[PDB]
Design a protein around this ligand. Structure first.
Ligand SMILES: O=c1cc(O)n([C@@H]2O[C@H](COP(=O)(O)O)[C@@H](O)[C@H]2O)c(=O)[nH]1
Ligand SMILES: O=c1cc(O)n([C@@H]2O[C@H](COP(=O)(O)O)[C@@H](O)[C@H]2O)c(=O)[nH]1
Ligand code: NI
Ligand code: NI
Lengths: 199, 199
């Protein structure tokens, strides 16, 4: 069980083939825009047959909509969901929620993220940019092993495989790099999550 | 037609029923995760048979993903999409893009929305909270008729019909209040868009 969550940013047929292939070998799968666009919400439970599914639609709506979206997903196959921390204090929380507080691309988070880690508690964990290992290390210093950290941005976005884990992350989120060649998951073989054994 | 964009946060068959009933009577329809979850992205094209469709998935992902998402949506018939302004400077741009810069619920936008409004150019327009018409007025004061403004939060969230338009909005975005009784669109008969006759 490599400390890797594979981002299935691809068509349904390809995603199912990849999931079946990597079943039991990775920590889970991230299902997002591309899959839901093609297959509707029913694709979540389908991928969930093969491992833990994190649904990532970057949830960022007001409470009456966000709460419904979260509940539809977690009750139809998702182990957890990613939501935007910028919504704070109007933020979904609890054990099914990962909160994104800084991104692999420049955004207004770049000035907010440390304050957000101070503000946000009682969630599953945080998403922090794995192409900025210093950010992961600082965050882990601040929160210790209280919450999970998962980190995208490995490969095309600049991050080296394992470098976010080295810096303190529990799992790295990897899309194109792995989709292009699923055998690359072996590059995570020597790594273990910093704090939590499961995402 | 009335300066109303109707938010179809509902089931596919209900959305089609309302869209058919309101075809030609309103400025457009807002299609979001409820419909896409059920019908996949094809629902965008279906609703577009009945009027202008703004797809609202509060788009907030990094450029490689966001650009593809917006493209798929426009290709399926969306006239425009709503994206989160907090992504700035990593923000999708152009005449297809409405940028949300303050919400009807409290968020981090609240302390910096004006600075953001000033920073964003070369987009179709902005989403500003219709339950806070003073914000709409201040925004319109800053940008004049350079950009569209559309405003949710009417009804359950506290805004009164027409108050955002009166304060400077072009269109009000209305969901539950109108879905519950589409005859209510008559309440917008006396109002007209501030700057733009179409969304
Ligand atoms: O800051 C972030 C947050 C993300 O969720 N992601 C997500 O992580 C994945 C990265 O994809 P890739 O490994 O092909 O670059 C995408 O699904 C993207 O939406 C990201 O790239 N940066
Ligand atoms: O700040 C905002 C931005 C929005 O897009 N919206 C959207 O406007 C609609 C409001 O729905 P309603 O009229 O039922 O309250 C929803 O689709 C919601 O996602 C909002 O309520 N507040
Ligand atoms: Ni999970
Ligand atoms: Ni439009």
């Amino acid at each position: 069980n490599l400390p890797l969550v594979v981002a299935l940013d691809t068509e349904v047929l390809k995603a199912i083939d990849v999931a079946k292939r990597l079943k039991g070998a990775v920590a889970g799968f991230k299902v997002g825009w591309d899959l839901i666009f093609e297959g509707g919400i029913s694709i979540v439970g389908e991928i969930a047959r093969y491992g833990n599914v994190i649904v990532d639609l970057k949830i960022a709506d007001v409470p009456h909509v966000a709460s419904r979206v979260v509940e539809k997903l977690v009750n139809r196959g998702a182990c957890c969901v990613i939501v935007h921390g910028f919504l704070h204090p109007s933020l979904p929380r609890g054990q099914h929620v990962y909160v994104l507080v800084k991104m692999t691309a420049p955004t207004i988070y770049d000035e907010m993220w440390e304050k957000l880690l101070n503000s946000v508690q009682d969630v599953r964990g945080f998403v922090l940019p794995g192409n900025q290992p210093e950010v992961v290390a600082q965050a882990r210093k601040r929160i210790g092993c209280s919450y999970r950290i998962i980190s995208p941005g490995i490969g095309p976005q600049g991050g080296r495989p394992g470098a976010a884990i080295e810096a303190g992350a529990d799992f790295e989120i990897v899309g194109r790099y792995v989709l292009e060649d699923p055998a690359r998951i072996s590059q995570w073989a020597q790594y273990r999550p910093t704090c939590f054994e499961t995402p």
